[PDB]
Design a protein around this nucleic acid. Structure first.
Lengths: 62, 92, 100, 88
RNA sequence: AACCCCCCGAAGCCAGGGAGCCAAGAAAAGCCUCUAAGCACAACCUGCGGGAACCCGUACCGCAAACCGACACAGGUGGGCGG
RNA sequence: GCCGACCCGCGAGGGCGGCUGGAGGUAAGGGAAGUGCGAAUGCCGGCAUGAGUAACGAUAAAGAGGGUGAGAAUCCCUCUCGCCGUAAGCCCAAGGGUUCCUACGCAAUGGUCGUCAGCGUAGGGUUAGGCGGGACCUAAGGUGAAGCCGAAAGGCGUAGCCGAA
RNA sequence: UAGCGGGCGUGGAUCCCUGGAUGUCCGAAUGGGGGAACCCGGCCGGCGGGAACGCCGGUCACCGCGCUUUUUGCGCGGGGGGAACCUGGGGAACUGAAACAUCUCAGUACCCAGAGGAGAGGAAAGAGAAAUCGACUCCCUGAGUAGCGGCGAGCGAAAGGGGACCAGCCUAAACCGUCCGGCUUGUCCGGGCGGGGUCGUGGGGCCCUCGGACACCGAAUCCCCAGCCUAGCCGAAGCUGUUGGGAAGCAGCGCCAGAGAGGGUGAAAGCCCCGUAGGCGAAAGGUGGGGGGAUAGGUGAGGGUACCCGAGUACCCCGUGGUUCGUGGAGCCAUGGGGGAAUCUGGGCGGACCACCGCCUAAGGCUAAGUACUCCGGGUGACCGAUAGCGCACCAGUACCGUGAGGGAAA
């Protein structure tokens, strides 16, 4: 159901859409590395987080 | 496609020796430039990086039973931070 | 596709084998192998601890996956086959003469 | 080869050698060879410049129709072989 | 720590050294220069300060047990040092 | 599948009895064949013989005390002895492709042993403006606009390009 | 694919179907190079102070055809792959002849190029003895016939008959308008385009007359639809006891059947499960004259004129192939070499040739269907059941062997 919430407000992401979208995903990938890092030390990441993060990016990138 | 080059911190005794100087080292992308590494990490940690180094890592081949295989290959890179500064996250 | 089967997590009777007549609430259907589980089958797993984490693993004799053709559902009676009638709107299942 | 208006290849039909009367009989010894067309070069003015033609004698004259035909035909702008292609 | 003196001294270095011989002993670019186009608010050359400088190999074996000989095979493998 | 000294058939066989075995079998009467093995130096697999035999791969050479370890001639340390030293030492290139190092271990690999290894598991390890090569140059040769030739496939081949110890 | 470690779904996931999206580098590989999966670039815009560096996005291979005045541009398309089948270009020897040359094996094997779901073939210069059949393709037959053949080995048709299928067309040329180009400006030569025309009772052109027409004829083209493929749903009828680890068995009494094919369920189930028989189903993509509709294109007589009717072709000869035809009395179709017409008072063919009589319209082109095939999906088997069946039931075109092509297991 995560999908519903995210996608709708990305066409709501149309106050300055394209430009803003580029920016948005840019910050999103950061929230990604931070994780892959935390999931390299060991105790700081509980899976999914990383996954769901990528899968949002997947859609955001439309 | 900016924060995407830096893959993860290379975690080893020897890597930790590099924290003593500005010589941080981590797992980078296969096809990545010492030029786009500096630019990348710099815009990834907002620290000016003087010297950059990449070397290549052939992944050892390990066998899980009668089935034989091959681990991915990697490209280790060690960076050099503007004399003085450091990376708070890697210092851990 | 069509892996859909007799029933889900609910009250189901057993005309199987060693548990002919045992009726319990089935707590897990596993469509990958066509087997369910109630309170019936209960073989004693002598093994120590299934996964290295944690001290001892208890002699747990917990339910063992039973084959689904040996389990019939049940409502105001004693378990019928499952025909399926339809409303003005959606669709669920009615047994041989009852409902639900 | 075959080339021009000629439109004639190189048949690899065979040739058998015979010994005979014919009012006594006839007999043999056979093999394969290939026959070629009487291909020759044709120098010709046409439009401007020159231009070569590699045809068989059978159809040389058929080249010399083309030339009286490129006269109601617009052709200039330094066209080396372009002339030839646009030659029907 | 001492870190000096004396001596042999190389095929090596100075290198494009010198001699003699016939069998008469690569090419191309960098390097120099000339000028045409072209420009002469350019450009090239000189110094100075600052800035920029990628991709790939880099372990280990390498006359052998890790290369070639089906083998921890008395065989085979080019170049340098070899007191 | 194993077993018989019983019953029947001239026989090939069949039937019955005990045993093993654990999910198939297919009368009477007919039907159709990938239909009967001892040899083919047959094919495939398994296992014998030779045989506890030859051999254990250079006649450079070993002994001991100590240690580790379930176990040690064979791993580790020290000492004594021996062999190489134009090499049996040290570099570079080719070819190898993780065999390097550290920890854990010995079924197999090791012509024995094995606590050892180049072997099993795991982790770590190769850093470059200056070394080598590429964003330099050409050689033989190759590729190859044009061009010339060839039933097709193609052949030759200028310019350019690829080509290095 | 369990375990560690965590998350998701009746605010309806997983999964299935249609479409859309991103799709690194190699590979026709196409910016250039290159030892495939890797190196090095040009231009435009952007990123990091970003000039030096780097990176991102787009773009830059070649060939053909048509506009573009040459020029540079723009537009459409080719390139490679495919199990087998198909057409064309090439084209073996073993072998059989119980030797061996002709012959055979055979236009097979294989090489090459091209084609498509097919391919080829096709509106008679046909067939051939009926004043008759009438495109083509394939099956059956004719028929081991006619015939070919060191008349040896052997090779082997056609019409006709039976059936499948059905299908017929457009053009070149005489002529007229037009644009343009040329040049000894002509009441013309040519090129492009349009009109015209397409035949064997011969046709068409040109002039005259008829009434020349509302009518007929009608697509292989086009649109809509059905049906259809690409996911799926409904689907009848059983309980008790008995032997047993376990029934579905044994038994007692019942029941459905347009469903008692098949498969699973701890053994042997019409009734438990999945199904089965019967009947429903598409937003999307796909398919589709089977139906309807429309268009493109097509339809008339007589008479006069003598224009037209596919050229290095016909035809003849030399060397050849195809065919049942191996030079034989050797025609016909095809064509390497040489000579070389005619526009219907024309040319071919009817097995050398001549005469008569008949068949037919070459030298341009396209055409559905029947047909072959089996990578692919489905059905079934007096097919296999792990030394069988594909080599491969299994992590196999792998291990392994070979430099390489290639070979190739076991389980």
């Amino acid at each position: 159901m995560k999908l519903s919430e995210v996608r709708k407000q990305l066409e709501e992401a149309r106050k300055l859409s394209p430009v803003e979208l580029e920016k948005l995903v840019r910050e999103k990938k950061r929230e990604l590395m931070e994780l892959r890092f935390q999931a390299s030390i060991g105790q700081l990441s509980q899976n999914h987080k990383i996954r769901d993060l990528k899968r949002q990016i997947a859609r955001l990138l439309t | 496609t900016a924060y995407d080059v830096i893959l993860a911190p290379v975690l080893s005794e020897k890597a930790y020796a590099g924290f003593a100087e500005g010589k941080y080292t981590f797992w980078v992308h296969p096809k990545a430039t010492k030029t786009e590494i500096k630019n990348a990490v710099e815009t990834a940690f907002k620290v000016k990086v003087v010297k950059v180094n990449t070397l290549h890592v052939r992944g050892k081949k390990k066998r899980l039973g009668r089935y034989l295989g091959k681990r991915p290959d990697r490209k280790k890179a060690i960076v050099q931070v503007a004399p003085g500064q450091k990376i708070e996250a890697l210092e851990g | 596709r069509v892996k859909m089967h007799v029933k889900k997590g609910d009250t189901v009777l057993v005309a199987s084998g060693k548990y002919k007549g045992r009726v319990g609430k089935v707590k897990e259907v596993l469509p990958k192998k066509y087997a369910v589980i109630v309170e019936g089958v209960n073989i004693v797993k002598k093994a120590v601890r299934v996964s290295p984490k944690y001290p001892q693993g208890g002699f747990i004799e917990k339910e063992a996956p039973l084959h689904a053709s040996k389990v019939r559902p049940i409502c105001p009676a004693c378990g019928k086959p499952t025909r399926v009638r339809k409303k003005f709107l959606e669709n669920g299942k009615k047994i041989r003469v009852c409902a639900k | 080869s075959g080339k021009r208006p000629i439109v004639a290849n190189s048949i690899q039909r065979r040739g058998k050698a015979k010994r005979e009367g014919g009012v006594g009989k006839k007999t043999t010894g056979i093999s394969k060879r290939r026959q070629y067309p009487n291909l020759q070069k044709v120098r010709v003015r046409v439009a401007g410049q020159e231009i070569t033609f590699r045809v068989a004698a059978s159809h040389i004259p058929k080249v010399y129709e083309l030339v009286e035909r490129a006269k109601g035909l617009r052709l200039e702008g330094l066209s080396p072989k372009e002339i030839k292609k646009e030659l029907l």
